Structures are given as structure tokens and as C-alpha cells.
Amino acid sequence: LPACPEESPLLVGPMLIEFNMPVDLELVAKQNPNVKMGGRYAPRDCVSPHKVAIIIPFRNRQEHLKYWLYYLHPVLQRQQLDYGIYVINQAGDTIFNRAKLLNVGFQEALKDYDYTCFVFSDVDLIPMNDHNAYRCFSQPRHISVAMDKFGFSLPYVQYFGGVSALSKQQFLTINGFPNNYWGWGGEDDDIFNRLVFRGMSISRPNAVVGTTRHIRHSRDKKNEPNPQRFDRIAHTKETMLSDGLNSLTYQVLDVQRYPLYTQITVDIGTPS
């Protein structure tokens, strides 16, 4: 098989996105026949240089997840990616830890296949243009750059939350993500700091191609704003040396291979 072309010729650009209808994953699976068990796909006509594991931090967001799957699967295939979907489900009902779940995703997906690119995406963000590439670049990539909830622009220029892509080397270089941001906020800013402290810069598509829709929702219980966040992001340079992949432990309770994704249910504990 020859290599796929540098840019996929299958892209259609701007798309219509809506979240007012019901979604049936059995149907979605039917519409996406080429997606194999566990939400895995690779083009059959060419070899993709992009081996992407898409990691979604998750707990009690099944409805959002169905929309995510309905919209992303067709887009990822048009992008001719060799990819896999991983939903990292936080076991239990104690305070949520978005970034720690993302580290679990990185470590566990690597046990399945030689992925060399990682896309970290919240479950309620849908790209509006398939030219917004869900793969890695020479520098860390911020993907959800123009979200409707932020008026189709970045909330601030150093904002790196929502959807992003880091190559395996970029992720390893920053010792992954922090494990101690419990509850909402700051962990994405900490990650931005990590990248800067390791000599990297943020790469982004333009505002139009990067347009993204956020499924408006209510505040989830157990993910209250972390009061220590402003304090923690001010010391990233020092804390990133000892807090991240090199200080991570967790216990996988279950791994389910659904037609459109792999769900890893994991116990990531409580604050220490």
C-alpha cells in the first residue's frame, strides 16, 4: 500500500452540526461499516502516517458521547487516520479528575497499538470543519480554537483546553499531564505551562477552520471549581518534574470493546 496523500482529498470542509435529535449507536455503527470493534479504523487503500489514539475523559456523559461518536467517526475516516477511540470512565462518585484520566488513556492505549499521536478531547466538543486535523504536528496542537461558547474565538491567547493533540514524544517530554488537579479548572493552563517550559509553542488552524460547537450543558456534580488551581498553575515548572506520568498509578476495573469505542473504567482514587 502506498502512503496516503499528505492532505486527504476526501474532505468537504464546513459541515452542519446539530444536537436536537436522538442518536442510535446501532444505526451509527451501520452508517460506519468500516469502523472495527473497539472503535478502530485505518484506510484500506493507503497507509496513514497518523496513528492516533483519541482520548476522552468521562463520567456520566453518555448522551454527549453519542453525539460525539455520530459526528467524529465520519470525519476521522475522511481524514484518513489510523485511529482508535478511548473513553476513560472514572469509576466511583468522588471528585472528578480530568487530567489524570487523560494520563490513564495515554498509558492504556499504548498497550493496544503503537500509537504515536494522542488527541485529548472533551466529550461535548464537535468540530464544524473537517479541515481541522485531528492528528499531530511538529509542535503541540490546539484544535478547538473557535468555540461557539467563547464567541468563535479563543477566550485568551494561551488557552489550550477542549481539544488538543500531542505526539507521543511531546507528551513524554512534559512528563504527561498533572495528576493533582481535582475538580474543575486550571489543568489545561498547567499543561500549556509545561509545553512552554519545555521549549514548545502552540500550533493552531485558523479561526474559521477551527470553529467548534460545544453542547450546552449544566454543571456536573462532583467537579466543583478547584480553589487551589490558581496556586497550582503558578508552580508548574517545579511540579511537572515529579508530578505526571512518573508519579501515576491507577487500577483498571473494566475494559469494554464496543463497536464504536473502547471504554476503560478506572479507579483513579482521591486526593493524597
Ligand X SMILES: CC(=O)N[C@@H]1[C@@H](O)[C@H](O[C@@H]2O[C@H](CO)[C@@H](O[C@@H]3O[C@H](CO)[C@@H](O)[C@H](O)[C@H]3NC(C)=O)[C@H](O)[C@H]2NC(C)=O)[C@@H](CO)O[C@H]1O
Residues whose CB falls within 8 Å of the CB of residue 255, separated by 6 or more in sequence, listed in order: 262, 263, 264, 265
The Cα–Cα gap between 210 and 149 comes to 13
Residues 117-156 that bind ligand X (CB under 6 A): 155-156
Q: Residue from 41, 51, 58, 202 that binds ligand UDH (CB under 6 A)?
A: 58
Q: Residue 159's closest CA among 189, 181, 197?
A: 189
Q: Residue from 42, 83, 85, 124 that binds Mn ion (CB under 5 A)?
A: 124
Q: What is the DSSP letter of 175?
A: T
59 binds ligand UDH (CB under 6 A): yes
Q: Residue 195's closest CA among 184, 206, 203?
A: 203
Q: Residue 12's closest CA among 128, 163, 148?
A: 128
Q: In one letter, which amino acid is 189?
A: D
- Angle subtended at Cα 11 by Cα 3 and Cα 1, rounded to the nearest 5 degrees: 15
Identify the three-state secondary structure at position 118: strand
Q: How far is the CB of 98 from ligand X (least distance, A)?
A: 9
Q: How far is the CB of 56 from ligand UDH (least distance, A)?
A: 6
How far, in whole angstroms, is CA 83 from its chain's centroid? 12
120 binds ligand UDH (CB under 6 A): no
Nearer to ligand X, 51 or 232 (CB): 232
187 binds Mn ion (CB under 5 A): no
Contacts with ligand X by CB under 6 A: the residue count is 11
Q: Residue from 107, 116, 223, 265 that binds ligand UDH (CB under 6 A)?
A: 223
Partner that binds at residue 20, options ligand X, Mn ion, ligand UDH, none, CB closer than 5 to 8 Å by kind: none
Are 226 and 181 in contact by the 8 Å Cβ rule? The answer is yes
**Helical residues (DSSP H) of the chain, grouped into ranges:** 25-31, 62-78, 98-109, 168-173, 187-197, 229-233, 236-239
Partner that binds at residue 65, options ligand X, Mn ion, ligand UDH, none, CB closer than 5 to 8 Å by kind: none
Q: Three cell numbers at 237?
A: 515548572
Q: How far is the CB of 174 from ligand UDH (least distance, A)?
A: 20
Are 115 and 168 in contact by the 8 Å Cβ rule? The answer is yes
Q: How far is the CB of 192 from ligand X (least distance, A)?
A: 10
Q: Residue from 82, 108, 124, 189 that binds ligand UDH (CB under 6 A)?
A: 124
Point out the annotated binding site: 57-61, 96-98, 123-124, 184, 186-189, 217-220, 229
Nearer to ligand UDH, 116 or 223 (CB): 223
40 binds ligand UDH (CB under 6 A): no
Residues at the contact surface with Mn ion, assessed by CB under 5 A: 124
Chain positions contacting ligand UDH, by CB under 6 A? 56-61, 96, 98, 122-124, 184, 218-220, 223
